[PDB]
Design a protein around this ligand. Structure first.
Ligand SMILES: [Hg+2]
Ligand SMILES: [Hg+2]
Ligand SMILES: [Hg+2]
Length: 264
């Protein structure tokens, strides 16, 4: 039902001082855009611990991608939801090649060789990411919300006409040039179990419709993700801190932390 926070001592928020003056920190549908400086982690950890929050983390690692699991899981252990209950779900064609990674207390891993309600009974939130990445800094409960997408690192400063949406009206993923909020990357999204299952259900149906019609969206599931989040606005948006490639993009001033990154 949600118990009281304990007494806590922290700096007073200042109404007449913005957290960040260099970036947009709230969407026009009033969803926070999560940048370093916008959140007090101690406050958020308390709120989420008091609810006994469990976070599921899902990765698909097929064929050569199994090689990335060791670094992925080891760095998640250092940086992902530390202090909270975590259930890793590794979807893989090579169950025996999954590295044996030492987990912290309250954390567990299931290997599933390649049923949806499993998630509803096991976790509160689902975080769906690509495996060819490593955590380099804190990725915590600040991301948790009914539905979130992450700003693609190549497009956060782009105007919408430049976004690589599906542009053919024949595709279910079609977005015209005068539409679009952001360009979300397919490599990092999540939310409540119910919201994530709704999204992935919608994108599986749209992709079949397209297959039937002999069309494949320009950026595949990412194109459909972008269509879905246009029409169903995420309740938080994560800044590109949460999906970076320092080799391709460097380290701009506007990024105070590089949290989850492409592997060198
Ligand atoms: Hg997922
Ligand atoms: Hg899909
Ligand atoms: Hg999708």
């Amino acid at each position: 039902f949600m118990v009281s926070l304990p007494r806590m001592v922290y700096p007073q928020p200042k109404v007449l001082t913005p957290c960040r003056k260099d970036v947009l920190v709230v969407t026009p549908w009033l969803a926070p855009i999560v940048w370093e400086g916008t959140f007090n982690i101690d406050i958020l950890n308390e709120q989420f611990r008091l609810q006994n929050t469990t976070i599921g983390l899902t990765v698909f690692a097929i064929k050569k991608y199994v090689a990335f699991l060791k670094l992925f899981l080891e760095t998640a252990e250092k940086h992902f939801m530390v202090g909270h209950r975590v259930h890793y779900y590794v979807f893989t064609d090579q169950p025996a090649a999954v590295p044996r990674v030492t987990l912290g207390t309250g954390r567990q891993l299931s290997v599933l060789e390649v049923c949806e309600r499993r998630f509803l009974s096991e976790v509160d939130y689902l975080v769906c990411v690509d495996v060819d990445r490593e955590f380099r800094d804190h990725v915590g409960v600040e991301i948790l919300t009914p539905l979130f997408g992450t700003l693609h690192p190549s497009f956060y400063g782009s105007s919408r006409e430049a976004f690589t949406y599906e542009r053919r009206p024949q595709s279910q993923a079609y977005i015209p040039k005068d539409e679009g909020d952001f360009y979300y990357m397919g490599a990092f999204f999540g939310g409540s179990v119910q919201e994530v299952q709704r999204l992935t259900r919608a994108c599986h149906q749209a992709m079949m419709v397209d297959q039937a019609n002999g069309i494949e969206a320009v950026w595949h599931d990412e194109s459909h993700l972008n269509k879905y989040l246009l029409r169903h606005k995420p309740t938080k948006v994560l800044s590109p801190e949460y999906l970076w490639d320092q080799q391709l993009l460097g380290w701009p001033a506007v990024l105070r932390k590089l949290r989850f990154t492409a592997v060198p």
